[PDB]
Symmetry: C2
Subunit: 256 residues, 2 copies
Amino acid sequence: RCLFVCRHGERMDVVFGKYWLSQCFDAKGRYIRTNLNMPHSLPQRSGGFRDYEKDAPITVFGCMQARLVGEALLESNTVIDHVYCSPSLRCVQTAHNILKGLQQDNHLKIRVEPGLFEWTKWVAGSTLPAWIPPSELAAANLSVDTTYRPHIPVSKLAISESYDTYINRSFQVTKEIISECKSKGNNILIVAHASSLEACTCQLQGLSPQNSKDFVQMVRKIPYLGFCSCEELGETGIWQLTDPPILPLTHGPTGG
Amino acid sequence: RCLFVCRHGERMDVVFGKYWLSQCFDAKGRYIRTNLNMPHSLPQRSGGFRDYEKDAPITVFGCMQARLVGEALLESNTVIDHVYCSPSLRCVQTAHNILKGLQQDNHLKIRVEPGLFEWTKWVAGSTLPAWIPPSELAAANLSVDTTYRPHIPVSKLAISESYDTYINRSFQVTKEIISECKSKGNNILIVAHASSLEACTCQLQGLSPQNSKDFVQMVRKIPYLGFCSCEELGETGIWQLTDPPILPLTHGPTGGFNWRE
């Protein structure tokens, strides 16, 4: 009956900049944090830590943003039956932290859906990020479903894809998600990107999509852990926006 | 040995603005939070919620900033022997949350020192904030020492004091703190305001205070939980700024549009 879509939390490569790896990895490739907003450790990646550069983790405070949202869901008695995320490490980690907040991290298993990845035009670099595969994510103590069959496998995503291609895959993927969850629980959570909130829901509400210009402008409105909800109207496959089951989250920078 | 001075955590009245009380208290004075960065509850105050007007609490994120600082101190095996704070609720709550991170919120008792309050020129009106007295703080789940006799009681703070008066009293209170702790511990933590980092340590180190115009520019640069450290050279009474025993803490805002639709 309800679909919840939310943006990942605060990024290491935004707080500490594009050259963040320079401030936490030494010449031998040892992780040595230089700020309390950096995690105590980062999982070992199969391609080495240089894989972090196009696929950075959330910060300590990004983890907290996510946890507070999970706690809010719990306090509102909002049951989540199915949870999906983009393959980006920041989305997987946001989902895992929401599950911790919800006290469901030992029960729900996150379905990693490469079809939830953001518009690949925004991939900062020549090629797609070396996403940590679900088996390795589960090994890094992220509550991921290793058996989930993705609607768009990683190899079916195209670098620098068109806007129309991006929009199309969002709606199709969302519809496939809704369909497979249909008989098996009421509420679905998708943890993905700012673009996902617009792209996953636009045609779902029966609205016409916007040009890439209006789209990019709408995407800039979404805060970290920005959270929206839809409710299915009868059948139709038309969903209508609803007031979210939880309060919004707003904080400033450490500043100074 | 070491003197640590830090700024309080993120303020409710900064994030949610001057009129935050109007947002979260109804006409009957019931607190109803409207954002996940607002605490689940707030302490009852003697004069009702309007006492918050000039004395705002920290946010959920402010509590976490302070907790992480306390956790970091624990991880560096930095033992805090005495802890003082400004009588401002934001400073008291910050110090309490640091003690929680430090796992000392049952052992250390915070010494509320009105002498650590910021420059009184920054208080609007002709009256000081209605600070929660130490007895009522200890009662409101904040780990304060009700036995502590302040160096500068509330009554001894001047309304709209001059810059050099603020700088002098900061110097004087810090020396008095240092002196009373000498027999009993090695490390002192002061939890206060942006202005406190320089005001408490400048003359201690024999450095000249900046003019009040340069000072204010310097002050706005200090982040929430910004943390500095002075160390004493044996029994000389000579103090010098040192690298702090912990890492800095930096994060951004939620971003996007503050308000939609």
